[PDB]
Structure formats: structure tokens, C-alpha cells
Design a protein around this ligand. Sequence first.
Ligand SMILES: [Fe+3]
Ligand SMILES: [Fe+3]
Ligand SMILES: [Fe+3]
Ligand SMILES: [Fe+3]
Lengths: 381, 381
Amino acid sequence: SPIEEQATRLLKEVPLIDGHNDFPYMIRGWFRNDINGQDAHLYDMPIGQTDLQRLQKGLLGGQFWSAFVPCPKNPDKEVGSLEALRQTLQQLDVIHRLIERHPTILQFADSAASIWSSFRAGRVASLIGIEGLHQIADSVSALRMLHRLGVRYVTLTHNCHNAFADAATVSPELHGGLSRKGERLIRELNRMGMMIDLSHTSHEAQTQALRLSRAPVIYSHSSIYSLRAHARNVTDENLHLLHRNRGVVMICFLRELLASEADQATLAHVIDHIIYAGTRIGYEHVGIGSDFDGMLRGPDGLHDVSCYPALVAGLLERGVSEEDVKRVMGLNVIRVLEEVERVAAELQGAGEECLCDELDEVWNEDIKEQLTRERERVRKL
Amino acid sequence: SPIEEQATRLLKEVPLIDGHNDFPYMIRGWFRNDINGQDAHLYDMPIGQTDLQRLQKGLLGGQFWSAFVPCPKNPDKEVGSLEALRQTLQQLDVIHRLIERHPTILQFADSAASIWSSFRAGRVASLIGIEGLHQIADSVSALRMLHRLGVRYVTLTHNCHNAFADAATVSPELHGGLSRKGERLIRELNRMGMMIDLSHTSHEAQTQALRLSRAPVIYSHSSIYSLRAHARNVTDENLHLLHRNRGVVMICFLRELLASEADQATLAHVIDHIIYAGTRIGYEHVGIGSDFDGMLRGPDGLHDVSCYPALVAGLLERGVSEEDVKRVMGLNVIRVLEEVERVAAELQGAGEECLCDELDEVWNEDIKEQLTRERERVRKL
Ligand SMILES: [Fe+3]
Ligand SMILES: [Fe+3]
Ligand SMILES: [Fe+3]
Ligand SMILES: [Fe+3]
């Protein structure tokens, strides 16, 4: 078929970069992050929508791998918050080991340039995101260290309220959008060069974040509200504010977000949602955000990671131009990451003050007097 | 003076690399890790033994900056252990920000090659160590992520027992040296390329670690037992086992470790301890491990970081050769780090299995059956 050969050529020309895949959490579920001697199973998994053979088969160019851990469920709220931080380091650890043990398939990337060089080499560009600010345990210092470990986006919430923002699926609201701490964190996220992800956040939290952010943001896995009403889908108001922000909505394959009856969801529905967004806010602000392995079953025609060529062929078949399809595949998300880096370098170059954690005093006044007296004794020598 | 000009020439030829300095903890105590607009104070501190002006003045070539946090003091033992992990990320964060805000003075290094290139440029080579396995909150995954953040040594204990080893200053003993988990961690530390530090550990814990380690280790700040009996000083038995291990004892400036009366401790005592070790196990296994800012007051002649030229001149004055003084200054600790990297690359090249954390099951058998049934449905398509 000429349309299938066209799709194959496009997948070789530019990288298809998917916004969200929870394959690392499946490895925690199935292997408990012990991948020693499991190469055969990693290439041909007995569960889930992702493995290394099917990842090659679908011709995917890049992937933001999710370092998701669940919302804290402990009655002791201090323990649960701190537990999520330790679990986050476990998930980042298994992601890095997964990449390092399979360098012919996966190559780590943390920038627009590292995505391209990975793609030139024939590797799946392997980026990282965390899915909820509950994962940082109220520590902005921890956030900056997660950035140093390779994290390049932060979903502001999962399905739980935190100190910074409101999740979509939980009622009643806590902050009514972003908190006072949340507003201040947006500045710090822009300053450090961390891409903001608005999937899972409430409609009001999206509106406030889209006005306040000095860099373009993403929805790593969300769909369109006007086609299917859900708390997790993006309203026409927020799509318009995404346009002004210069961000990208990466369209989701979740069946519940594409149709009222989940078993009726299809490849065609995903293409409808892409075309809706592209028509109304331009094809330079739309992406692909599967959420593979964040679901049991996918839509008809998008059952696993091998099915990306069918999506590309489908978009071309509806009359979306090559240039616009290339944008949706990956160019748009690369641009956002590029702009997030440029804004961070500009703010860091101007010498903007970083956000610091509120720490307890470790010394009393007696200790501080001893230290000052000691310093002046040394000055006399 | 010809001996002072000789010392100045040596300090320019090779880097003096100090084993331990807790300046980052002083910044937590005094500033609470908020260094915004504090450059004037960072160059001329009102407290402590370290600042950026005196660091230049003493002609120090490199420094392992301590990311120390205190032993957990919480009655809830889960909270205290997890709290130490969050505090560790705060200390690593302020160390990185300290280096990034002062690039003319400090430059990050994580290897023998990065130490030299930093020294060629005229910067203080800025490395990182953590001071106690209580800082990892029982997570080997967290340990590997600390390595990725730039940590290049781990003191096995501070002044508290942990799941892996016994501290020197706490009685009674818990494990009687290393635990079963501790023995297994030694293999993982050698595999990942993390330098083992035996300061603060018990005499028996040192003996067991020195026999079991496949890479050379250090004492980042310890002194000689035969000259002054203390639980924190190295016995003649362990000095001999350090020789076989090919490790380095980095001599400490702590007054309590150099003399029975702390107020009698001097520069001469530090030189006595270096010469004792060098004479008995060779000058290629001795280093300098100040522990500046882990103490209120230093010995006479070693009051702060400006005093390193007096130590170098003092060693030359006692008849220690230039080549041997260069070794003590930094060549020895560079060699250990070099060998720790070479052993890690060899074991990683052979494909040795990494140590994994013991995780809870997140899925019950009903969820696992749904996932396998779903996988086989996809195989039928
Ligand atoms: Fe997810
Ligand atoms: Fe999700
Ligand atoms: Fe210390
Ligand atoms: Fe110490």
C-alpha cells in the first residue's frame, strides 16, 4: 500500500515521540525491579502492552518513560509522603538499569539534541517523567535532584490532591486550582528547566498554570473534552490557553477518555481527537500520549506499542499533510523541550533566585555564640 | 624561606586533595541552605573553618565535600530513616548549587580525569561523599541514584549502628562488624564504582571490610591508634590489612584523635601520624583528611583551610621526600578513585548481577491473571 510505505518513510525521517508509558511500573509489578537474567522476558513479555521486540516493531522514535509511584495511602501522612520519595528513586533506578542493559535498543536522552543523536543511531530516545508532585515529598531540593537524575517533566498531580495542586478525579477541591506553594513552584520549574505536565490536574489548575507559566507546557496523556466529557480531558477554554502558552496536548489512548462505552473505543476515535485539536489550535500544538501500560486494554487498532504505524497511516488517510503528521509525531514535543531549556538558560543567566525548602534550626543560640567567638579568635592570629 | 617556596611549588605541581570537609552542613546550620545574596558571607564567613577566600589562600587542589546528615533520632524508626534520605538530597542540592554559583573557584569532579582537568583550570576539584549508610534509608536503589548525583564515597557508618555495619563510638555491638546485608553491599559498592570509607566504623567492621573488598578503600578522616588510643583511630592490624587492600588512610586533624588532652594538639602531632603510617605501610597509602567543620576548634597551626601550606612545609622539614609529599597531598587518593573505577568497569564488563531491594507485591493473583489473559488475546490478533 502507498499510504503504509508513506507512514514507514515518515517514521524513519523524524522520531515519533510518545508522551507517557508506564512500562517501568509493570517491571515493578511483575519482576519487582529485578531484571537480572530476564532479557528473554523483557523482549517478549508475558504481560502488558510494552516489550523490547514490539517496541522495535512499531518503529517508535522516542519515549518519555514514567517513573510513576502510587499516591500515598498510609494513615501516617509523613511516612506515606516520604515513602513515595524512596519508591520514586527505585523507579528511576530500574529505568536507568533497563536503558544501560539494552543499549542497542534504548539510549538515554534529556534534551532536544540528545533525542536527535539517539534517533540518528537507531535507538529509541529514552526520556523520563514523574507522575505527581506527591513523589517529591514536599522537597524542592529533591525536585532539583530528580532533574539531575534525568527527569524532564513533572505531572503536577496524579489522582490525589497535594500541597501544590488539585487532581481532576478527587472531590471536593482542596486549593481550587493551584495553591500558594504551587504558584511559586511554577516559577522554580521554569527556572530549573523542568517541563510542566498538566495531565491528571483539575480544569481550574490547568487554567491557572497556563496563565502563570513562562515556558510552554504539555499534557503528556489527555484527550478532548468537547468530543467526550471527562474530568481528565482538556476543555476548549484550556486548549485556547495552551495555544497562547505555545504548549502541546499529547492525545491519549485511554478508552474511557475516547468514548462513553469503553469497549467501543477505536483507532478512529484517537484520530478524531488529534484532528479536532489540530483544526482548532493548529497542528503545531498536538502530540501523541498513548498512556500504554497505564491501562489493561487499548482501543481497537491500538492494542500495544507495535501499532504506531497504523496511527501514522490513519492520519495521512484523513488528509493531514506530511509536515503536519511529522509535527504530531514528535517535532512539537521536541520544540517544547527546546523552549523549556532556552527559558531556563535565560532565567539562570539573569541570575534568578531559586526556591528553597523551609528547614528547621539545627543549632540553638549557645552553639551559634561558640562559633562566632571561635571565628574571632582565628581572626586575631 | 626555601622550604616555604618548595611547599608553594608542590601545591602548584599536584593537587592537595582533602578527604573530608563538612562546610555543606555549616551552610545548613547558618543559612539553612539559602545562599541567595550571601556571596559576601560565603567568601568571608562569620563562623566555621571554611570559606571561599581562605580556601583560595590555602592553595587546596581538591576536596571531598561531605553531604552528612545526623543519625536518625525519631522514636518512629521508619520516619527517621526516610527523613535522613530527604535531608541527604537537601545536602547534595546545596553542594551542587554552591559549586554552580561559584564556577571560578569550585568545579565539580567525579573521577581521576575530572580532578586533573579541574586542577589544570585552577579550580578546587569538588567531589562528594555521604557520611553513613543511614543516609540511604535501606535502599540500594537510592545508593545507585546518589552515585548518579555525583557521590563517590560512602562512609559505612557515622556514630550509630545501621543495618549494614557497626559504628565505633556506640556500645554494645549490633552485628559484631558487618551484617549479612553489609557483606553483600560491599560487592555492590565495588560493582557500581563507589569508594568505601571506613572512618567512624568499628575495628572489627574495618577488618572484615578490608578482607572482603575487591577494590581499594579509604579512611576519609581517621588517625593512628598506636600514637593515641581511640575507637576512631586505625590499629596496626587494620593498617596492615589496608596495605594488602591497596587503600589510603587520610590523617585527621581532630584534636581528640591526636592527643589525650585536646588543647595540647598541634600541627606536629598531625605530621607524627602521617610519618608513622608512611614509615610502616609506605607513603603511597597515606593521605590528608582534615575533617574541617566537623569540629569547633583545630590543632595549633591547623586552625582553618588556609593552613595547608604549613602542613606541606612541615612534612618536608621532617625529611619526607618531594615525591612522598606529593603522594600524601593527593596522588594516592587519585589512584584509589582510579582503581575503584577500573574494578567497577571490569565487573560491569563481565556482567555481574546488581543487588536489588526487597519490594512488596503490588498486584494480587487476580490482577496477574487479567494481565496474562489480556496478553494472549493480543497474541491471537
Ligand atoms: Fe502513568
Ligand atoms: Fe496517568
Ligand atoms: Fe563529617
Ligand atoms: Fe566525621
